[PDB]
Write a protein that binds this DNA or RNA. Structure first.
Lengths: 75, 77
DNA sequence: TAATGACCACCAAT
DNA sequence: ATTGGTGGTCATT
DNA sequence: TAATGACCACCAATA
DNA sequence: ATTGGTGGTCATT
């Protein structure tokens, strides 16, 4: 999983930079760097935006994912 | 609003009390010594709460961010 | 004209 | 059977 | 257990 | 109309 060093040390086309547990940083050509969270609700796949980076830190994105997991843990 | 400085210096009480941050987030301080984060929310009119973790393991900013995650989920719909 | 939510595919490992 | 990683698309705000 | 999710009354503040 | 802030309870695990 990511450190904040690995993120600034990146570089194309849209690509996903994975942390863990479905959380990733989306990098688009322009410089658009936005956190997202892959999840399923009773089988269906979606994603939720956790804000823009570096405004939203990695540890910020992680804690957002944590709160969301607790919500999804029911049920 | 809540600050960590306020939490640090909370007076002991014989009774549970809630210390409000904002947007439904509070710290529940129980007589014993336990301090736990809870978020007050409603899903289509029905009220509940979710535990966000023990303070200080979970910090004020940590809990706030768990809340911002949860609020984004709730904002659907 | 972006960003977001809602998906697709295959696949490995729990 | 379900999630998470790699790598994408497309419609609705 | 002590902590959690659900959810009560009363009302003030958002919206 | 809906939430957020007081201040509580209750039954499971």
């Amino acid at each position: 999983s990511l450190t904040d060093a690995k993120i600034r040390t990146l570089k194309d086309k849209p690509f996903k930079v994975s942390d863990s547990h479905g959380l990733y940083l989306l990098v688009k050509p322009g410089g658009s760097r936005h956190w997202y969270l892959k999840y399923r609700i009773s089988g269906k796949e979606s994603r939720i935006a956790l804000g823009a980076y570096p405004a939203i830190s990695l540890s910020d994105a992680r804690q957002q994912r944590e709160g969301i997991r607790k919500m999804l843990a029911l049920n």
